Design a protein around this ligand. Structure first.
Ligand SMILES: COCC(CCO[C@H]1CC[C@@]2(C)C(=CC[C@H]3[C@@H]4C[C@@H]5O[C@]6(CC[C@@H](C)CO6)[C@@H](C)[C@@H]5[C@@]4(C)CC[C@@H]32)C1)COC
Length: 1116
């Protein structure tokens, strides 16, 4: 605290150019660290030598800036988070520089420098703050995944402990396989791993993972494997591996349960993000009403144009006289609808003429195609001057739509004039055809169903710019960190050209992008860990770097998808055909027939959008193939055919294959971006249309309130049905005191730590097995069983066995006890559920998350509209499963040809498995490509001698059928998501911020619990002793028994039925009165209307009139 001169004279240096120069310095540092040519070890080629010295200048300017800030602010620089981050970065940099100068791991902290750029730039701090704040309330949800990612993993340790040790090394350290087949053990019960290679040896070894990484031993490896499986990428590979290793049909249930739990968790996270976004899309947005401001702006524009037309009419209604007379006729003629129809027909005909190019290269007609184009200019000019003559000079020119048309036509005529002469790289025909596409924008003026969409697309870019910049900066920092960590260490002791590397900046950036997309990232991570950190205790430090790079990346992309949701918010602002019974049976809900009707009535608009996108593709393909891709399918079908393998699963495969003409017009790939991006918007816009359709399907079911209020009506109808309970407690006081004290936070914590160390005994079981650790875990298991028996004995007798089988959680722990006593009576595969019971005790931790279990109570109990969609999806599976049997019979299972014993189809359960695998999108393109007309299918039948060279297996129709199946399944799961989010809208997106009605319900449950006496008639001298604390949020304040004693004892009359008898229902009604607004005695109008309209229109209580016997003491 010192401000005579220096503090006053140093806080003045806060110029805008000062921050500009600081940002320029940061950008220069980022560029300097960008190249930093990596070397194996200390190669001073005069480049890194100078980059070493530049760091001195950067450090000194940063530290003088920090000193200025510290002097200016004193003990206020530190509390700010970003200032503290910058100070810590600077301290680390100066410390490492000093340590190096005194005499290289800390150099990676320099990579953290670009983050400081976001510390000062506006319009980015707010975005990052909103992003980090949105995910906080959902953090608890993420914790659940941890439990899951442990639980099932433990199951594997029980069932797949060292099941990959046995191999099929042919002679000595070499398996009898082409380095691809899993050397499954020569099991005593044959059927899997037969290893019939005419001379085989089955010996223990490591022939599982490509590097011995994802083996189920070494529990951390099991966790890595289950995490890799839970991301929906390559789980079929490990499923086939384990099925070949141990046997068929036994373990698939585990993976199916894992995948369905993962899907449910994804749904839950999406609903949580929905609630987080809705908490701000309406609140604080309807307040300022910026949408109303935009509506006012467009209304003002419309009114201005109308009044200007009025003024033009007024001036026109009265040398020059002939010109004025012709002005009226010119202004009247252009407004005729016949003229507009003729003009639009001419424009469409000309656009068809310029689009008549069918990729041919003739000469007799191409010349005819030339001159007419020039005439089109006249056809695109006559209106123009008329709009400059019929309408005002400054009126028509200023509309933000027709001005674009003027620019387009002027550019087109100038380009035509230019291409009339010679020009290198003309592109004139391309841009002329592109502006002919813009003629359809006039067609877009009519039928505004696309004009509104394109206006929303134009609007959304300004908001999405910040998010895309943040994502680009994020991938930049992560690419820099990846380049620093490896720096060309991808030797692998091999020669084959790896598809990715971290030696140069662009290749590292594209590798990071590919990892973020999740395509083949597992193999890249395996290679990265095997480069230096071989499987061991310190070798896993690399692996975590990948994991974060996915989640913190993907979530952001999902947040970008949430931004897309915000953009959406911006867009919202003949054999066995006897199965007809379900069609008649499912006609009861009637909640989806309207959905089908809306979909099949909007399919026309969907097809029109598909057609216009196909026309755009035709234009782009014509331009590209006429200008490039010169041969040393079709201009409107080749892109579609590529898209059949480029559905966002295969375009990364295209990049993967093309990373090896070569660079001749690679922009098509980026075109394959933009088009897909256009789809990724317009289809999303169609989905946004579907959103509106869902808003019409389910969002229009709000009907009329027909009650006193909107939320207080819900409170009244919720607090009038609440009834008091008793909660009987037995006579045993000592044992129940032991329950209250011992069986409490202490007991649950000790149970959690003991089961955790039990897992450390079983989850962390020794790799392979050792006799010492074996007997250690045996005796520890005996001790655990003993302590479990002791705890259940003290929880059984002390709980008054009469009351033992009453509570629901008591029955749950009773089931746990019965599992334990099964354990002690059997202490064995397929019966070792008791150990799972121990991991089932981990599920008990979820109970301790009562605050989150309500979420579960709203999901698993949400099975009200779920049965209808579930029946629809299972009948879809039935109809699409039984139909494939006869058409794909004799599937021709063969080893290592993508159709094998694991890929078998003739068996019904395996066919279901295959169709489920295709449903999730796990490389179903290969499945589609595995059924060709020329492929032989089980040449065992008598007329299969290939006499005519014909394979009796067409199967060239499953592509369209499976595409339709994928679309239907995606639409149905979207429908179920909409159903569940609508079911939980009055639960999650409610007023849960501070004073949500569910908080009132929880406090009602507290009232049912907070009064242990349960005497029914609680005295006024007794409620002050215990019921003094009523409710913090709803109550007036912490001035018990009543903060407003006068109001709460006069308006709510002091209850004195029997020595101050208070009724639970009467007290709840009093709390409602505190929430509602009715005055003291003499409120006959509002109070009597509320209490007598109960019979008719407020809360139907014609029966159970007991309220009209307890309220007259208080209210009636
Ligand atoms: C009482 O509250 C309702 C009321 C009336 C208006 O209803 C709105 C409620 C949210 C709702 C249904 C609306 C628009 C965008 C909808 C989202 C589009 C995204 O599409 C998905 C589907 C899966 C992905 C393919 C893309 O993301 C979802 C995550 C997202 C979505 C289905 C979540 C729910 C959203 C309309 C006032 O609310 C403003």
């Amino acid at each position: 605290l010192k401000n005579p001169i220096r503090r006053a004279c140093i806080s003045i240096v806060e110029w805008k150019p000062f921050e500009i120069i600081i940002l320029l310095t940061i950008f220069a540092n980022c560029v300097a660290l960008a190249i930093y040519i990596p070397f194996p070890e200390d190669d001073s080629n005069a480049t890194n030598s100078n980059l070493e010295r530049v760091e001195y200048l950067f450090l000194i300017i940063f530290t003088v800036e920090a000193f200025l800030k510290v002097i200016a602010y004193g003990l206020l620089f530190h509390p700010n988070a970003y200032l503290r981050n910058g100070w810590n970065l600077l301290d680390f940099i100066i410390v490492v520089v000093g340590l190096f100068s005194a005499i290289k791991a800390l150099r990676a902290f320099r990579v953290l420098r670009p983050l400081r750029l976001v510390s000062g730039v506006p319009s980015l701090q707010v975005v990052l703050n909103s992003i980090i704040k949105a995910m906080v309330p959902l953090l608890h949800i993420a914790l659940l995944v941890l439990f899951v990612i442990i639980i099932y993993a433990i199951i594997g340790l029980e069932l797949f402990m060292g099941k990959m040790h046995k191999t099929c090394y042919n002679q000595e350290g070499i398996a009898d396989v082409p380095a691809e087949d899993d050397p499954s053990p020569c099991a005593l019960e044959t059927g899997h791993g037969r290893q019939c290679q005419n001379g085989t040896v089955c010996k223990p070894g490591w022939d599982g993972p490509k590097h011995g990484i994802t083996n189920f031993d070494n529990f951390a490896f099991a966790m890595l494997t289950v995490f890799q499986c839970i991301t929906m990428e390559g789980w079929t590979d490990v499923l086939y591996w384990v099925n070949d290793a141990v046997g068929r049909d036994w373990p698939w249930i585990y993976f199916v349960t894992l995948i369905i739990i993962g899907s449910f968790f994804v749904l839950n996270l999406v609903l949580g993000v929905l609630s987080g976004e809705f908490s701000k899309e309406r609140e604080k947005a309807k307040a300022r009403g910026d949408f109303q401001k935009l509506r006012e702006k467009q209304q003002l524009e419309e009114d201005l144009k109308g009044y200007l037309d009025w003024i033009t009419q007024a001036e026109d209604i009265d040398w020059r006289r002939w010109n004025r007379f012709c002005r009226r006729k010119c202004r009247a003629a252009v407004k005729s609808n016949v003229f507009y129809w003729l003009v639009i027909f001419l424009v469409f005909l000309n656009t068809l003429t310029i689009a008549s190019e069918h990729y041919n290269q003739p000469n007799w007609l191409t010349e005819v195609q030339d001159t007419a184009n020039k005439a089109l200019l006249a056809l695109f000019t006559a209106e123009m001057l008329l709009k400059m003559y019929s309408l005002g000079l400054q009126a028509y020119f200023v509309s933000l739509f027709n001005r674009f048309d003027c620019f387009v036509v002027c550019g087109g005529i100038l380009e035509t004039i230019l291409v009339e002469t010679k020009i290198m790289s003309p592109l004139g025909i391309s841009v002329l055809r592109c502006v002919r596409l813009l003629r359809i924008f006039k067609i877009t003026r009519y039928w505004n169903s696309l004009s509104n969409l394109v206006a929303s697309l134009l609007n959304s870019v300004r908001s999405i710019a910040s998010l895309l910049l943040l994502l680009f900066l994020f991938i930049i920092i992560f690419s820099l960190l990846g380049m620093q960590l490896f720096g060309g260490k991808f030797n692998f002791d091999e020669m084959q050209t790896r598809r990715s590397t971290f030696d140069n900046f662009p290749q590292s950036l594209l590798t990071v992008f590919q990892i973020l997309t999740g395509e083949d990232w597992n193999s890249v991570m395996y290679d990265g860990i095997m480069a230096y950190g071989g499987p061991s205790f310190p070798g896993m430090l690399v692996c975590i770097y990948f994991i974060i790079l996915f989640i913190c990346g993907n979530y952001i992309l999902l947040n970008v998808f949430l931004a897309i949701a915000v953009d959406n918010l911006a867009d919202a602002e003949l054999r066995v055909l006897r199965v007809l019974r379900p069609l008649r049976a499912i006609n009861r809900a009637k909640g989806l027939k309207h959905v089908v009707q809306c979909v099949f009535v909007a399919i026309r608009t969907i097809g029109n959008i598909v057609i216009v996108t196909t026309l755009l593709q035709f234009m782009f393909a014509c331009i590209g193939v006429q200008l490039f891709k010169g041969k040393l399918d079709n201009v409107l079908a080749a892109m579609m055919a590529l898209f059949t393998v480029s559905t966002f699963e295969g375009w990364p495969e295209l990049l993967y294959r093309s990373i090896d003409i070569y660079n001749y017009r690679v922009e098509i790939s980026i075109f394959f971006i933009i088009y897909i991006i256009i789809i990724a918007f317009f289809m999303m816009n169609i989905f946004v249309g579907f959103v509106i359709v869902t808003f019409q399907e389910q969002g229009e079911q709000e009907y009329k309130n027909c009650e006193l209020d909107k939320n207080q009506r819900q409170c009244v109808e919720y607090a009038l049905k609440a009834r008091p309970l008793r909660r009987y407690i037995p006579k045993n006081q000592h044992q129940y005191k032991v329950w209250y004290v011992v069986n409490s936070t202490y007991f649950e914590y000790l149970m959690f730590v003991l089961i955790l160390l039990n897992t450390i005994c079983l989850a962390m079981q020794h790799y392979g097995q050792s006799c010492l650790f074996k007997i250690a875990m045996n005796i520890l298991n005996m001790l655990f069983t003993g302590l479990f028996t002791v705890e259940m004995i003290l929880k059984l007798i002390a709980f008054k066995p009469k009351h033992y089988f009453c509570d629901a959680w008591n029955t749950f722990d009773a089931l746990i006890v019965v599992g334990s006593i099964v354990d002690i009576a059997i202490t064995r595969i397929s019966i070792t559920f008791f150990r799972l019971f121990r991991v089932m005790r981990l599920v008990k931790l979820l109970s301790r998350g009562e605050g989150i279990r309500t979420l579960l109570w709203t999901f698993i109990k949400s099975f009200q509209a779920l049965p209808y969609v579930a029946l629809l999806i299972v009948m879809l599976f039935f109809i699409y499963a039984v139909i494939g049997m006869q058409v794909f019979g004799k599937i021709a299972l063969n080893d290592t040809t993508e159709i094998n014993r694991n890929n078998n189809f003739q068996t019904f359960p395996q066919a279901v498995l295959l169709l489920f695998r295709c449903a999730t999108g796990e490389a179903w393109q290969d499945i589609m490509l595995a059924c060709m007309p020329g492929k032989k299918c089980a040449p065992e039948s008598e007329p299969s001698n290939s006499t005519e060279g014909e394979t009796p297996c067409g199967s060239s129709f499953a592509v369209f059928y499976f595409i339709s199946f994928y679309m239907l399944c995606a639409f149905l799961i979207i429908n179920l998501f909409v159903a569940v989010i609508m079911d939980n809208f009055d639960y999650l997106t409610r007023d849960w911020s501070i004073l949500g009605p569910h908080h009132l319900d929880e406090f009602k449950r507290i009232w049912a619990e907070y009064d242990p006496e349960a005497k029914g008639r609680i005295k006024h001298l007794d409620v002050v002793t215990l019921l003094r604390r009523i409710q913090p949020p709803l109550g007036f304040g912490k001035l018990c028994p009543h903060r407003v004693a006068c109001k709460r004892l006069v308006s709510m009359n002091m209850p004195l039925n029997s020595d101050g008898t208070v009724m639970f229902n009467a007290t709840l009604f009093a709390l409602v009165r505190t929430a509602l607004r009715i005055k003291t005695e003499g409120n006959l109008e509002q109070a009597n209307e509320e209490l007598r309209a109960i019979i008719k229109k407020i809360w139907k209580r014609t029966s159970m009139k007991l309220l009209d016997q307890v309220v007259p003491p208080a209210g009636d």
